[PDB]
Amino acid sequence: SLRRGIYHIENAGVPSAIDLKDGSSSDGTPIVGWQFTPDTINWHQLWLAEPIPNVADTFTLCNLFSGTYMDLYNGSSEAGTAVNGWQGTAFTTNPHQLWTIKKSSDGTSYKIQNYGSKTFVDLVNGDSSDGAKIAGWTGTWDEGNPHQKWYFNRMSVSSAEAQAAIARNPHIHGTYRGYILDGEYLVLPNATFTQIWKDSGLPGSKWREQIYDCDDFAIAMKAAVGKWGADSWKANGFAIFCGVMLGVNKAGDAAAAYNFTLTKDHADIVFFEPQNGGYLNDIGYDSYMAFY
Amino acid sequence: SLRRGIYHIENAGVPSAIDLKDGSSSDGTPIVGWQFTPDTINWHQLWLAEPIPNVADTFTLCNLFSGTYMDLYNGSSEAGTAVNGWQGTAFTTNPHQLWTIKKSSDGTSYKIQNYGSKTFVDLVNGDSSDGAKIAGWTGTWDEGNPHQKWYFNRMSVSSAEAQAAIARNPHIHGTYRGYILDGEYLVLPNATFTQIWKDSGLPGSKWREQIYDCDDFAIAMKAAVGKWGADSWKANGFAIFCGVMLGVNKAGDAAAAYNFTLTKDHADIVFFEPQNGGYLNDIGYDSYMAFY
Amino acid sequence: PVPR
Amino acid sequence: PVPR
Ligand SMILES: C[C@@H]1O[C@@H](O[C@@H]2[C@@H](O[C@H]3O[C@H](CO)[C@H](O)[C@H](O)[C@H]3O)[C@@H](O)[C@@H](CO)O[C@@H]2O)[C@@H](O)[C@H](O)[C@@H]1O
Ligand SMILES: C[C@@H]1O[C@@H](O[C@@H]2[C@@H](O[C@H]3O[C@H](CO)[C@H](O)[C@H](O)[C@H]3O)[C@@H](O)[C@@H](CO)O[C@@H]2O)[C@@H](O)[C@H](O)[C@@H]1O
Ligand SMILES: C[C@@H]1O[C@@H](O[C@@H]2[C@@H](O[C@H]3O[C@H](CO)[C@H](O)[C@H](O)[C@H]3O)[C@@H](O)[C@@H](CO)O[C@H]2O)[C@@H](O)[C@H](O)[C@@H]1O
Ligand SMILES: C[C@@H]1O[C@@H](O[C@@H]2[C@@H](O[C@H]3O[C@H](CO)[C@H](O)[C@H](O)[C@H]3O)[C@@H](O)[C@@H](CO)O[C@H]2O)[C@@H](O)[C@H](O)[C@@H]1O
Ligand SMILES: OC[C@H]1O[C@H](O[C@@H]2[C@@H](O)[C@@H](O)O[C@H](CO)[C@@H]2O)[C@H](O)[C@@H](O)[C@H]1O
Ligand SMILES: OC[C@H]1O[C@H](O[C@@H]2[C@@H](O)[C@@H](O)O[C@H](CO)[C@@H]2O)[C@H](O)[C@@H](O)[C@H]1O
Ligand SMILES: [Ca+2]
Ligand SMILES: [Ca+2]
Ligand SMILES: [Ca+2]
Ligand SMILES: [Ca+2]
Ligand SMILES: [Cl-]
Ligand SMILES: [Cl-]
Ligand code: NA
Ligand code: NA
Ligand code: NA
Ligand code: NA
């Protein structure tokens, strides 16, 4: 089954992602195919998939930027029916906004069926153009037609996935304790993490004994990413991935605070030194505490 | 012995505190007697006492606001010698900036002797006027003269004192773990804590599931107090007291994040709800984790 | 639980 | 120790 999470949804036939045109929150804003840049935040192209309780493999798809939902215009089963952003809620019973998402015959891509109409999300004519129509179209679950096949590129981790990434790290102290704060996290490219740091004012902060030392830099970076999350996205039900760790050196006679993020593959953590903005696989400390 | 810490130093004879005039960092800025408001931050009247290793009961006194040190002008033993703020360092060997501080004959107030001159800090003529001269003056350790007697009103806690205040609280979960980040903390009046909250932008922040929920408010309040500390004070070697706690309700089925501060007497904690700015003796959660 |  |  598709898991709850944030997805970048990429056509199987051509390199176009499902894009809410101009990120607009207006009802009836067209959802279109659009090119994308890997290892960036594709601002109009991220979708929060919320499973519907007691409806198998069925989800709402909320655009992270607009907070509006993928909507099949008037629930029509006609081929060519507009797919648009529309106001809604994460657990609506409105079938226009409910989507059954299951693996295609290829077994890696998915098809996206409207729960009401039983028609499929279709990049019309397989057009790779920026702004190409996406429509509800006649189809079947088993056919090869790449107009209706979609790679769900997972951009979020669950708290359980973050927990696993930390646990396989070789710089974790024996006494380590982790404190989880949220459920589902958008993983930032290091380019975006770095931009939040650059914009935070930390690069221009002086290290000062106790009054503005490593713990202040690390907590300030975590607050800066929290603020960025709320300010950047209108959807609810997810957090931005940014951890704080406390660590102790090998000699057990010095401690430090720092941040951490996750690799592109979501399998490992990477340490972030918030005084200088460096990324490190080894920061010179074993983590005894983390909150994220 | 006087312990390392931040003090408000109040004359025993008249309600004048030791004040660095206008908070000025200029060398030779006069230190004067000045009236004060209890349960406020008295901005020019806070002194960081740093013990000198291997010199008994001897300290530098750094003004928290200016970062400059109490200095006996040219180390003169003449009665009437100016006491001024002067550039220095926490562990100087300059005797002009070294002060032996021991209990007076009354046993609650202290006298302040210059280590070089062996003369005493003296509110000249016991004058209660705002801007009254403070001078080095002839004296003895045992005499009653209130011109030379000073109450050291302790405005900071050690991490060990904070740890004790948390431990005597009745809302601590059995699984509680605390993570200490600094050594010595300025305790804020609730009026100042509240002002930092009002100025943080949190009062005008909306609660949003995961993306800006209780953990975001609590970490944002802690960052706001950290920033305020560094921006407000030029001295180093202390932190501002502002904790974050995670707690679980009695039923064990809901958790929350919040802040905490300390009572005026430094003996107990008080919970701070960063969404609404309320102070509470019972926030409805037992703390399982704290960092401060 | 997880702080909400 | 204490994070410095
Ligand atoms: C190239 C083309 O691919 C297929 O046609 C698609 C359409 O396929 C879908 O709709 C048709 C009816 O119009 C039929 O129901 C098919 O099972 C279904 O997948 C559709 O994707 C549109 C819009 O993008 O484009 C093409 O017309 C295939 O059926 C055709 O024979 C032809 O090979
Ligand atoms: C009221 C007054 O109090 C005392 O005199 C103080 C001064 O006391 C200090 O200096 C004198 C010498 O001038 C002497 O060494 C004394 O032991 C010492 O405490 C001093 O505090 C000044 C400046 O504020 O004010 C008064 O002159 C006492 O000796 C006097 O007899 C008289 O009672
Ligand atoms: C917010 C905005 O994002 C970018 O423009 C979006 C655009 O972004 C996609 O397409 C561009 C090329 O047009 C790149 O491939 C990006 O990597 C994609 O993410 C689309 O989403 C369209 C239609 O919705 O809206 C534009 O605003 C970027 O080019 C802008 O500078 C700006 O950062
Ligand atoms: C920063 C400044 O603080 C206050 O003025 C200080 C003054 O503060 C003391 O005296 C005033 C009365 O003059 C009150 O009793 C305060 O409670 C004291 O803290 C002195 O420190 C003088 C001389 O150094 O400097 C003034 O700036 C306040 O009155 C100002 O509004 C302002 O907040
Ligand atoms: O128009 C406001 C509503 O938007 C969504 O429902 C509508 C639906 O009632 C119908 O008009 O068709 C449109 C276009 O397909 C939408 O799906 C919300 O689900 C409603 O609660 C309401 O806000
Ligand atoms: O003047 C700069 C210096 O300030 C302090 O020492 C002086 C001392 O050398 C003498 O000039 O007397 C004055 C007034 O009493 C000061 O105590 C610092 O301790 C020096 O390191 C230097 O910065
Ligand atoms: Ca949370
Ligand atoms: Ca600190
Ligand atoms: Ca520290
Ligand atoms: Ca959160
Ligand atoms: Cl087929
Ligand atoms: Cl006497
Ligand atoms: Na439209
Ligand atoms: Na379901
Ligand atoms: Na002077
Ligand atoms: Na000493």
Numbering used by the authors:
A (entry chain AAA), B (entry chain AAA): 2 to 293
C (entry chain EEE), D (entry chain EEE): 1 to 4
What's the publication's text?
The Marasmius oreades agglutinin (MOA) is the holotype of an emerging family of fungal chimerolectins and an active Ca2+/Mn2+-dependent protease, which exhibits a unique papain-like fold with special active site features. MOA requires the presence of calcium or manganese (II) to switch from the inactive form to an active protease (Cordara et al., 2011, Wohlschlager et al., 2011).
Unexpectedly, co-crystallization of catalytically inactive MOA variants with different substrate mimics resulted in complexes of the enzyme with cleaved peptides. The synthetic peptides are anchored to the active site through three main contact points: the oxyanion hole, defined by Trp208 and the backbone NH group of Ala215, the ‘site B’ Ca2+ ion and a backbone–backbone interaction with Ala256. The presence of an arginine residue at the P1 position unambiguously maps the S1 subsite to the carboxylate group of L-domain Glu210, which forms a side-on bidentate salt bridge with the Arg guanidinium group. The P2 moiety binds to the S2 specificity pocket lined by residues Leu247, Ala258 and Leu182# (with ‘#’ identifying a residue provided by the other subunit). The peptide complex structures show well-defined electron density accounting for the N-terminal fragment of the substrate mimics after proteolytic cleavage, representing one of few examples of PLCP structures in complex with a proteolysis product. Coupled to the long time needed to grow the crystals (2–3 weeks), this could explain the presence of a cleaved peptide rather than the full substrate.
